[PDB]
């Protein structure tokens, strides 16, 4: 707990950071997508499949 | 050091999947089994959702099947999903079998008692699951399959009503025949695991028919997109069954309600077990068709004592191959008198038939075996 | 030259000329556990990156 | 017993030796013959340049038939060419079992 | 000389695995729609006036 703490920790952790958004943005609109929420999929210019 | 090889879990599955040698030259055929252990998963999960509205009393059965039909939504793609899918779980079978009959897989002597034990618990639950929608073919099959005990000569009677519950097929056989139904497909899984269990200290054999450890494989990186495709084409073919052609492999009568009273007149079963029902329409008598139709399947058993070639292979000897094909057509020929009424032609080719089919493999495939055998000086 | 040289720099040319590469590959026996060749170019790249 | 009728069944033999398939791929006789125990010590006795090159043919006919393909017309085994080179081994191997057999039963 | 449309497709995508996961969700993302009504203008194609939808006006809002 306490060793993770430390300098080459916090530059691997800036160092995989992106991939955490690119996973996150994957989990969140697939998220979307599959429950097919009607109040976020709307805003999107061309899935309208919802009535 | 890779943490498959550490954790447990992770250990038998990189035996039994990722890691595992297998022959590099396995075929097409092989895939099949594989198929069939997919086919389980469909045949739970799709029969899963069938429960949860069936109602196994007989004064029921029916009318909640329609209402599974109608009422529920979506509910008829996973009637027919489930009904043809029993069809291609069938289908893949006897072509499991068959390669296992012609590439001389049958060595593997404990792998195929098994095989055979769990062919038999695979019929059971065919059979039991076909009398649960509860029409007139479902009903009367029981009643025809039941009474095939009876033939038992001392025990008989007392055995069958064991069975009914009652006198006559009712309510009761129905819901024990959906409670064995329902139980018998997992312990057709667990037997499934002996099955690979057996299976893998010696390894899958290649067609050739060769020892292939020289061209061992990694399973993962091949064999599970061949497998990919060959399921992908198997639920090609079963939602092509389903969406387009539903009916066809099944019967019409079993959407009339089941009378006691009244009899239908072609009453002929499903179509996997017609062959068999072919032996019983053959022999006159009772317990003689009786012993003929459990020997039809035991008869699988004693194929390795009666292999006498120093091959395993067919197609290395082609006259045991033509036999082979004899077998298979032979098949095609009691499969299609099933489905027909006795009358004068019909009656006759059924027992050639069935005696043809006992003949070729009792006798005749050992000795052209060993006609092949002198044929290649040794 | 070197001093210029720096962990980003080597992130970026390493991700270069060695990530997700089709190596060339030699054995001389007795190779027989040596992963077949889908297996090394499939270990040429990670899926959690 | 027969004579010319042998040289009969040595055309048949010919015939149905190129009906089995391995010389399409290269086999050897003795290549084909289902590896039990006997047959197993049997290959264990094998003279190892014999071995090498049996474990060789067997390789090229499983990578064969891993492509589906077969060995070109010229370079096929001929009925006159095999050398059945482990019959000896294995008629040794055979003989010892039903030497130690016919012991055991006494 | 000039990149392929392919390789820019590539480089700026398919060499990180998660874009490409992410690419892939967003593709299904439009192609469920487009297929979606894609195939449903062809089935009603083949059969116009056969199904009811078009078949409402004979009677509807009164
Ligand atoms: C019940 C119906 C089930 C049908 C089989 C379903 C699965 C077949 C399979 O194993 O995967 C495809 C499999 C792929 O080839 P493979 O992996 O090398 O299989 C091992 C070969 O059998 C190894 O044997 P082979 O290399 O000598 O080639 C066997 C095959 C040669 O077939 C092939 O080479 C592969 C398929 C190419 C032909 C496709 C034709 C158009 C579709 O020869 C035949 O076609 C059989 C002769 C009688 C049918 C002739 C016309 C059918 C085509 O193809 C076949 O096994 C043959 C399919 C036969 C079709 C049914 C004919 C009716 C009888
Ligand atoms: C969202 C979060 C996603 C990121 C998770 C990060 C977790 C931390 C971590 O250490 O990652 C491990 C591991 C990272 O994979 P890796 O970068 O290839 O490194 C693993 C070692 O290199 C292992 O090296 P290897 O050469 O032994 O690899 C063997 C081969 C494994 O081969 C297979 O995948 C077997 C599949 C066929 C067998 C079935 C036969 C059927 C008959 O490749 C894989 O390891 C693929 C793993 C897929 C499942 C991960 C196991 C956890 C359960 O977890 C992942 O696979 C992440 C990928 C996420 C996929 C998208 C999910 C969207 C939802
Ligand atoms: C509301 C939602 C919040 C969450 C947002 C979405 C989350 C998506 C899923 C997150 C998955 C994380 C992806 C990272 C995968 C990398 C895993 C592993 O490889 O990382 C290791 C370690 O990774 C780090 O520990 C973690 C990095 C990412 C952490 C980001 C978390 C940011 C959260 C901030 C809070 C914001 C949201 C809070 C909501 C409550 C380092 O790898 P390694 O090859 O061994 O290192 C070299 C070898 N060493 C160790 C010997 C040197
Ligand atoms: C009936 C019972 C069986 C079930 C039915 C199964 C039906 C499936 C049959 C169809 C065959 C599918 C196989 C096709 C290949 C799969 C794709 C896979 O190969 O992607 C690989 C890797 O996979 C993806 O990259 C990661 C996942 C991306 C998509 C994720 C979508 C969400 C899935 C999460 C499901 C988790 C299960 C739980 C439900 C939520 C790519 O590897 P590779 O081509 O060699 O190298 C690429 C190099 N890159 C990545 C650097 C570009
Ligand atoms: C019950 C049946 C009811 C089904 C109704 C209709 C079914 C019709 C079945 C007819 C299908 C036969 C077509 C097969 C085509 C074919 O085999 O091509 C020849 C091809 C040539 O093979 P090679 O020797 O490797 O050639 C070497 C070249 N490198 O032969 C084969 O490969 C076939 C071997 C696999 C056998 C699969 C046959 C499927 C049927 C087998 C079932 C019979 C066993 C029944 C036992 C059931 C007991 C419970
Ligand atoms: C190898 C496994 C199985 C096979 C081959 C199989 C096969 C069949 C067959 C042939 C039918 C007759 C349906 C018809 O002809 O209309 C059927 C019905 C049924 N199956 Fe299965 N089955 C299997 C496993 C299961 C499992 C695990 C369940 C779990 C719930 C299940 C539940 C049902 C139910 C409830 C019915 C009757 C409902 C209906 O027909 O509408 N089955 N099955
Ligand atoms: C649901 C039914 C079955 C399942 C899930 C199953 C499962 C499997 C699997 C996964 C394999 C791996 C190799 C391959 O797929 O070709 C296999 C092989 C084998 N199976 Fe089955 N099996 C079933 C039924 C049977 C039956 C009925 C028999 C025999 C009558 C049988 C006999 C064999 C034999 C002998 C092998 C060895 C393959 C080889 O030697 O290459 N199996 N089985």
């Given at each position: 707990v306490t060793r993770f703490l430390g300098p080459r920790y916090r530059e691997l952790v800036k160092n995989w950071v992106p991939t955490a958004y690119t996973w996150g943005a994957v989990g969140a609109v697939g998220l979307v997508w599959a429950t097919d929420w009607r109040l976020i999929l709307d805003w999107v210019p061309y899935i309208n499949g919802k009535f | 050091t890779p943490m498959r090889k550490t954790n447990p879990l992770m250990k038998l599955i990189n035996h039994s999947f990722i890691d595992l040698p297998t022959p590099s030259n396995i075929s097409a055929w092989w895939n099949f089994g594989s198929l069939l252990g997919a086919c389980?998963?469909?045949?739970?999960?799709?029969?899963?959702?069938?429960?949860?509205?069936?109602?196994?009393?007989?004064?029921?059965?029916?009318?909640?099947?329609?209402?599974?039909?109608?009422?529920?939504?979506?509910?008829?793609?996973?009637?027919?999903?489930?009904?043809?899918?029993?069809?291609?779980?069938?289908?893949?079978?006897?072509?499991?079998?068959?390669?296992?009959?012609?590439?001389?897989?049958?060595?593997?002597?404990?792998?195929?008692?098994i095989g055979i034990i769990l062919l038999l618990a695979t019929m059971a639950t065919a059979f039991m699951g076909y009398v649960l929608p509860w029409g007139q073919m479902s009903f009367w099959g029981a009643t025809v399959i039941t009474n095939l005990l009876s033939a038992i000569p001392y025990i008989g009677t007392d055995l069958v009503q064991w069975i009914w519950g009652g006198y006559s097929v009712d309510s009761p056989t129905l819901t024990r025949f959906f409670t064995f139904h329902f139980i018998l497909p997992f312990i057709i899984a667990a037997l499934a695991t002996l099955h690979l269990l057996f299976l893998h200290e010696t390894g899958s054999n290649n067609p050739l028919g060769i020892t292939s450890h020289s061209d061992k494989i990694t399973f993962h990186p091949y064999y599970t997109i061949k497998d990919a495709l060959g399921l992908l084409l198997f639920l090609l073919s079963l939602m092509t069954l389903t969406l387009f052609s539903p009916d066809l492999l099944g019967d019409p009568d079993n959407y009339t309600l089941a009378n006691p009273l009244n009899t239908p007149p072609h009453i002929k079963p499903e179509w996997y077990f017609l062959f068999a029902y072919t032996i019983l329409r053959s022999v006159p008598n009772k317990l003689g068709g009786v012993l003929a139709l459990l020997l039809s399947?035991?008869?699988?058993?004693?194929?390795?004592?009666?292999?006498?070639?120093?091959?395993?292979?067919?197609?290395?000897?082609?006259?045991?191959?033509?036999?082979?094909?004899?077998?298979?057509?032979?098949?095609?020929?009691?499969?299609?008198?099933?489905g027909q009424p006795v009358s004068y032609p019909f009656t006759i080719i059924g027992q050639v038939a069935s005696v043809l089919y006992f003949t070729t493999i009792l006798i005749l495939m050992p000795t052209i075996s060993l006609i092949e055998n002198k044929m290649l000086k040794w | 030259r070197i001093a210029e040289v720096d962990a980003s720099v080597v992130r970026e040319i390493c991700s270069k000329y060695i990530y997700d590469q089709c190596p060339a590959v030699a054995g001389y026996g007795p190779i027989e556990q040596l992963p077949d060749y889908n297996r090394i170019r499939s270990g040429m790249f990670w899926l959690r990156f | 017993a027969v004579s010319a009728s042998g040289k009969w069944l040595d055309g048949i033999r010919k015939w149905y030796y190129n009906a089995a398939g391995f010389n399409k791929l290269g086999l050897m006789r003795d290549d084909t013959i289902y590896e039990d125990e006997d047959?197993?010590?049997?290959?264990?006795?094998?003279?190892?340049?014999?071995?090498?090159?049996?474990?060789?043919?067997?390789?090229?006919?499983?990578?064969?038939?891993?492509?589906?393909?077969?060995?070109?017309?010229?370079?096929?085994?001929?009925?006159?060419?095999?050398?059945?080179?482990?019959?000896?081994?294995?008629?040794?191997?055979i003989r010892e079992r039903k030497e130690r057999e016919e012991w055991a039963k006494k | 000389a000039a990149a392929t449309l392919?390789?820019?497709?590539?480089?700026?995508?398919?060499?990180?695995?998660?874009?490409?996961?992410?690419?892939?969700?967003?593709?299904?993302?439009?192609?469920?729609?487009?297929?979606?009504?894609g195939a449903d203008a062809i089935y009603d194609h083949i059969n116009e006036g056969k199904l009811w939808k078009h078949i409402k006006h004979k009677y509807e809002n009164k």
């Open positions: - | 389980l998963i469909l045949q739970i999960t799709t029969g899963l959702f069938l429960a949860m509205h069936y109602s196994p009393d007989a004064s029921t059965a029916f009318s909640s099947i329609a209402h599974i039909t109608r009422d529920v939504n979506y509910g008829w793609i996973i009637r027919y999903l489930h009904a043809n899918g029993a069809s291609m779980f069938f289908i893949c079978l006897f072509l499991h079998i068959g390669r296992g009959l012609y590439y001389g897989s049958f060595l593997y002597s404990e792998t195929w008692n399947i035991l008869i699988l058993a004693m194929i390795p004592i009666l292999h006498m070639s120093k091959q395993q292979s067919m197609m290395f000897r082609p006259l045991s191959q033509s036999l082979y094909w004899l077998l298979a057509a032979d098949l095609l020929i009691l499969t299609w008198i099933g | - | 047959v197993k010590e049997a290959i264990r006795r094998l003279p190892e340049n014999l071995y090498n090159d049996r474990m060789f043919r067997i390789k090229r006919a499983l990578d064969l038939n891993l492509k589906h393909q077969i060995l070109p017309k010229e370079q096929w085994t001929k009925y006159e060419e095999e050398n059945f080179y482990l019959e000896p081994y294995l008629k040794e191997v | 392919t390789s820019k497709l590539y480089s700026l995508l398919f060499r990180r695995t998660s874009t490409f996961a992410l690419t892939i969700i967003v593709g299904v993302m439009f192609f469920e729609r487009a297929f979606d009504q």
